[PDB]
Structure 1
């Protein structure tokens, strides 16, 4: 089997992407944030504290003839941005772009933190990291991809995120029309539960490539590109007036600037992020200070190849017995 679904930016900055997902019988369609950096499929629901729902579409398990309470199971998750959610668990039928999994754990939120409430466009998350990170207790649950894998034509999914435009998540096949050149594959460590890999270096604008190993994660659920302080300083030094602002929480730059590109290495191959992809707009409405799309990972503990990086590529998440990542230009 295969599936194919369009993913759409939630706003004009590409802060995140939503993909429609059918849950239950009859189908309830929710717009979920597909997140290769976590492993829980959770939704706003009829159980979510009412004051914490503000415009989201909710899953109502009592209206699904295929929903079953997973007795005794609870979940609770905290994300790198400080947000969180928790609740109980049902199993139900879940379909993405024509690919159907029966018995998928659908984690129903009883509580969500303010950032989720405040984002009316995201009805939940669909985790696509390794199932070892799933938070369901006392019986850990599998991701949608893990459950679908055996049925797929090939044990892969691909992320093709757009810049200011829709893109595609495909399951079970590699669309050879969706990228240019060849796909370069690189090793993955699953030891931390992430799609963790080692970039071979970077370049700033037209500058020379610096060969240096940068371990990080391919994370569709993180907006920005978080890299070591040395690398980020080298990038922003090429932008007149750019500076790191402790009050804003990262590097800012004059909105009048034209930004240089940023290249990252995948083996001997190179992915070029156009400068425009690194502009995240005014820090507050009407400001002439703009927020940078490349930020330091020094306070995180891990480097993160988020959407800023991934949307410059066609990305293959290869879930073969030994997983690997593939990157192509597009």
Structure 2
């Protein structure tokens, strides 16, 4: 089988992407944030604290004839950005872009932190990292991808994120019309539960390529590109007036700047992030100081190839026995 679903930026900055997901019988369609950096499928629901729901579409298990409470199961997750959610668990039918999983763990939020409440466009997350990170207790549950894997024509899903525009998540096949040239595959470590890989280096604008190993994760759930302080300094040093601001919480630059591109290495191949992709606009409405889309990973503890990087490529998440990542230009 295969699945194919359009993924749409939630706002003008591509802060995140939402993808429609059918849950239950009859279908309840929720717009979830597909997150290759976590492994829980959780939704706003009829069980979510009322004060913590503000505009999201909720999953109501009692209205689904295929929903079954997973007796005793709870979940609790905290994300890299400080946000969190928790609740109980149902199993139900979950379909993405025509691809259907029965008995999918659907994690029903009883509580969400303010940032989720404040984002009315995101009804939940659908995790696509490795199931070893799944927070369900006392019985860990499988991701949607893990559950579909066996049924899929090929044990893969692809992320084709748009710049200021819709894109596509495909399950079980590689759309050879969706990219240019070849896909370069690179090794993955699953030891931390992430799509962890090692970039072979970078260039800033038209600068020479620096060969250097950069270990990081392919994370659709993170907006920006988080890299070592040395790398990020080298980038922002090419933008007049750019500076790291403690008060703002990262590199900012004059909104009047034209940003240089950033190239990262995938084996011998190169992915070019256009400068425009690295502009996340005024730090506050009407400010002439703009937030950078490349930021330091120091104090995160891991480098993150977030959407800023991933949307410049067609990315293959290969879930074969030995998982690998593939990147193509597009």
Task: Please state how far the C-alpha of 1:174 moved relative to its aligned partner.
Answer: 0.1
SS in 2 for 1:11: coil
Shift of 1:197: 0.1
Deviation at 1:243, TM superposition (A): 0.2
Q: For 1:189 and 1:80, how far apart are their aligned partners in 2?
A: 19
The alignment partner of 2:284 has SS state of coil
Distance in 1 (CA, whole Å) between partners of 2:23 and 2:322 is: 30
TM-score, structure 2 as length reference: 1.00
Shift of 1:149: 0.2
The TM-score normalised by the length of structure 1 is 1.00
**C-alpha offsets along residues 29-60 of structure 1, whole Å, 9 cap, x if unaligned?**
00000000000000000000000000000000
Q: Give the distance between the partners of 2:36 and 2:46, measured in 1 at CA.
A: 26
- CA distance in structure 2 between the partners assigned to 1:99 and 1:9 by the alignment: 22
Deviations 1:100-145 (A, max 9, x none): 0000000000000000000000000000000000000000000000
Q: For residues 289 and 216 of structure 2, what CA distance do their matches in structure 1 show?
A: 29
Moved over 2 A (4+): none
Q: How many corresponding residue pairs? A: 330
- Write out per-residue CA displacement over residues 43-95 of structure 1, whole angstroms, 9 at most, x where no aligned residue: 00000000000000000000000000000000000000000000000000000
1-structure distance, mates of 2:6, 2:151: 21
Partner of 2:2: 2
Q: In the TM superposition, what is the alpha-carbon distance from 1:235 to its structure 2 partner?
A: 0.1
Cα deviation 1:205-241 (Å, max 9, x = unaligned): 0000000000000000000000000000000000000
What SS class does the counterpart of residue 238 from structure 2 fall into?
coil
Find the counterpart in structure 1 of residue 17 from structure 2. 17
Structure 1 match to 2:208: 208
Q: Deviations over 1:258-314 (max 9, x none)?
A: 000000000000000000000000000000000000000001000000000000000
Name the SS of the counterpart of 2:62 in structure 1: helix
Task: Give the Cα–Cα distance (whole angstroms) in 2 for the partners of residues 19 and 76 of structure 1.
Answer: 23
CA distance in structure 2 between the partners assigned to 1:292 and 1:137 by the alignment: 38
**What CA RMSD, in Å, does the superposition of the two structures yield over aligned residues?**
0.1
How many angstroms apart in 1 are the aligned matches of 2:23 and 2:201?
41
CA distance in 1, matches of 2:28, 2:198: 39
Work out the CA distance in 1 between the residues paired with 2:299 and 2:11: 27
Q: Which runs of 5+ in 1 are unaligned?
A: none
Distance in 1, matches of 2:45 and 2:188, equals 35
Distance (Å, rounded) in 2 between the aligned partners of 1:164 and 1:82: 26
Aligned to 1:88: 88
Partner residue, 1:50: 50
Separation of aligned partners in 2, 1:318 and 1:244? 36
Secondary structure of the corresponding residue to residue 94 of structure 1? strand
Q: Find the aligned partners of 2:75 and 2:163 in 1 and give their Cα distance.
A: 33
Tell me the equivalent position of 1:231. Answer: 231
Question: Partners of 1:253 and 1:321 in 2: how far apart?
Answer: 44
Give the C-alpha shift of residue 177 in structure 1. Answer: 0.1
Distance 1:216 1:3 in 2: 27
Q: Could you tell me how far apart the structure 2 residues matched to 1:204 and 1:178 are?
A: 26
